[PDB]
Amino acid sequence: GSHMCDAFVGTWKLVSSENFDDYMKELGVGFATRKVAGMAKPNTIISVNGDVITLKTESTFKNTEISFILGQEFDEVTADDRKVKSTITLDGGVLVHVQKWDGKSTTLKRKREDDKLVLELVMKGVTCTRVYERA
């Protein structure tokens, strides 16, 4: 059968970024990692096997991989090496990813808009948008 996650499945490459440096500062990312991360053009591969969604991100300097069930909290190590407790849910057709660590929180929303995969990353007052297109 068809699922709301179907539209996300596939291989994606970064095409544009807005306010990523500010967002990384809010996360506590240091100067050098901000420079190196800002240069990268990651690929993200989203796949589904039964109820398990896998999201991989590959880049020149860092690869990440999470597998999860919607609504079930899990341990995640982020690209900037935060050790977080994460939960990912569907809100309509938007994947909502909340990461909690040291009493802090950031929310990452993934949505399909036109032929793009749009990521909205929010920490305190700062919103970054990262746009991906099919690879």
Ligand SMILES: Cc1nc2ccc(Cl)cc2c(Oc2ccccc2Cl)c1C(=O)O
């Ligand atoms: C959502 C997201 N969050 C990030 C959080 C922190 C950093 Cl340093 C990179 C991030 C990042 O880029 C990367 C994610 C993995 C490897 C490399 C990069 Cl630059 C993404 C992203 O666009 O998927």
